[PDB]
């Protein structure tokens, strides 16, 4: 995401006016709050018997469940076939090589002592198999599990856009440029709120930002909101116009009519295409969001038997969401 | 240095507390603070008519005199020199035709981003520029200097042992390596709360942090806290054995014997070279601390003639500067 996080105006909220709400969560995200979140006591990610990591599993699994126990109901969005916003210069900028796959497969990293996440997103080391385990996991685990054309953000955002949803939910402001009229934060990470962190965002208890007032506060129209951050930087331009910062874009963009004008030259990727993606992203509107049930032998199977997970407590946890899943009343 | 921070336990005090206390600022950290924070309401950071930054020299001098009001006796410890073992010298980083650093200025602190503070927080002798206009700032203020042979938080835990200051400052925990026996962060930025973000490490009110209760509670002692941040990444070793992070570090430390000499093989850049150094650092002590009266109008003359601050404000602080500072100083 872009680093216009100083600038959005935000609100409170406890994980009780998330009754009963349709929630879209981009699932990549979400995932990668875990591989962070959920590790061992001896500081390192979960990890099976034959080595792969599993933290983003033993996520998914116990925190939709605890938000649908909340009564949260929630559809992890997926990524399409990510935009690959950069420029041409070798046609097909193929099998470019360098190391691919022992990148992030032994991603000396997640023991974390830096992120790299910017690792597997450059041109490769499809780490594809990490979101393989999740759809598959969530289909199982009974949860409505959205794909989505181009970015994940972007789908999340529109089912906002048009009544489906009351938001997106992500630790990336990424929806707000895609027009969501809300963005929760803080659901895959909410705890208890107290005394020391990771990075602690001392109330993890959940946040409310509504484009309503991330725009009036800050007074710019959306597609200069979109401006503003791509001169700071996004995803598909990763440090933006060189020296400027959240405040300094919230003016170039803020008054004089077209500000990315005055760039491009001043070298970076073409701007333009970016912003057009934020303003028009690739969004499907095929989907069904809730139809069917936990698939327990299936999950134990997944979960113990082959990913060493305590059959014990997934079994007296697959339980949790059914208790979950099958009794919102009729109504 | 030293990402140790979620283990090391800080209590929060408030500033009020240390009324009569010296503490030994490490400048060049503080002198990164204010280039961090004291920015202008644009973005931008302030600036001298000439192109030149003055964010260090504005935070500097008003928050000296601003930490005075409330009656704490400052000194500020000035590094020395290196040591440096590190990238491997004859190749990496022998600091002979540096770039003239633009993407310090330019691309990087204009850009709201200390990836910055690489060139000179670590290896003062790239823009040393700072730590002169300081030395002069400081002592024409009449606010002690003290030099020392190498590192500056290693001298302010000398300083803190013996008792001749309550204790460090800083916001790296470097000193509570070298020895100090408290340490105080937030001092440079202790400020206003209530205003959603501005930068910071944990949050805005000084905090005391003392190395009994850090050491007690990680039933380590010294020379063992020493070798965990060796394995995290210290600033001679940046990137620490790779995988390893502080809550593993702090097992591996706890377990064994002599945690170096497993990973002082392919992992190398001297891992019991940096030991020595957090344990015997080069500490000086022929200082004198003497809070004397400051040189009114020549101040006035290098930050308002020669820096284009303004008068009336700059003659306030130095209105309240004079004030405050007989009622510490004794003999």
Redesign the interface.
Known sequence: GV?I??LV??KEIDLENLYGKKIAIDALNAIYQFLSTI?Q????PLMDSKGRITSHLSGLFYRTINLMEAGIKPAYVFDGKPPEFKRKELEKRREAREEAELKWKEA??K????EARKYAQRATKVNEMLIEDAKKLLQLMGIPIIQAPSEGEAQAAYMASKGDVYASASQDYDSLLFGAPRLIRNLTITGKRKM???DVY?EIKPELVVLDEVLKELKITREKLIELAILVGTDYNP??V??????????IVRYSRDPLAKFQRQSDVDLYAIKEFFLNPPVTNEYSLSWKEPDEEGILKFLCDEHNFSEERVKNGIERLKKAIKAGRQS
């Open positions: 680093p996080g100083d105006p935000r590790r006591e001896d500081g390192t000396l990293a023991g974390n002592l830096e020391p962190g990771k001392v440090g933006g060189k020296g400027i910062g959240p405040k300094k874009a919230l003016e």
